[PDB]
Design a protein around this ligand. Structure first.
Ligand SMILES: *[C@@H]1O[C@H](CO)[C@@H](O[C@@H]2O[C@H](CO)[C@@H](O)[C@H](O)[C@H]2NC(C)=O)[C@H](O)[C@H]1NC(C)=O
Ligand SMILES: *[C@@H]1O[C@H](CO)[C@@H](O[C@@H]2O[C@H](CO)[C@@H](O)[C@H](O)[C@H]2NC(C)=O)[C@H](O)[C@H]1NC(C)=O
Ligand SMILES: *[C@@H]1O[C@H](CO)[C@@H](O)[C@H](O)[C@H]1NC(C)=O
Lengths: 50, 50
């Protein structure tokens, strides 16, 4: 299928209307970030030749 | 099959036709002795970076 970017939302804009929240949600979301790799070393002579 | 390693007894059970053994990295780790039908685990000699 041709992908849909998102669901339609025509915001009800006008020159004298404002939307003020009457409640709220405390949202907890995760972010995963890699920090380090495995520290590897090579004995170049031993690897190439044994 | 020639190389260097430390030979110890192994609890792996070879099938009777098999002679050599390889790990995930396709390196030899066990060989069956031609004289006595026993399986010797070959771990590499303990190298390290000084
Ligand atoms: C504020 O009012 C506008 C219109 O007076 C609302 O907009 C309508 O919203 C409904 C459902 O959300 C839609 O079916 C209509 O098509 C919208 N009309 C227009 C002209 O946009 C709006 O939802 C209201 N906002 C709140 C928070 O109640
Ligand atoms: C604001 O929203 C919260 C939830 O997001 C409302 O708390 C709920 O209230 C109803 C009835 O008042 C309870 O049945 C739910 O168990 C409550 N949920 C939680 C998570 O506590 C709260 O009432 C809303 N306040 C206003 C003024 O709208
Ligand atoms: C070879 O000789 C050894 C020592 O006598 C013996 O243990 C073994 O059974 C013989 N046969 C084979 C097929 O290894």
């Amino acid at each position: 299928y041709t992908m849909s970017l998102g669901v339609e939302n025509s915001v009800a804009y006008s020159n004298n209307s404002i939307a003020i929240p009457t409640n709220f949600t405390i949202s907890v979301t995760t972010e995963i970030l890699p920090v380090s790799m495995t520290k590897t070393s090579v004995d170049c002579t031993m690897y190439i030749c044994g | 099959l020639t190389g260097t390693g430390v030979l110890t007894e192994s609890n792996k059970k070879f099938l009777p036709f098999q002679q050599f053994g390889r790990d995930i990295a396709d390196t030899t780790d066990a060989v069956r002795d031609p004289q006595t039908l026993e399986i010797l685990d070959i771990t590499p000699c303990s190298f390290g970076g000084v």
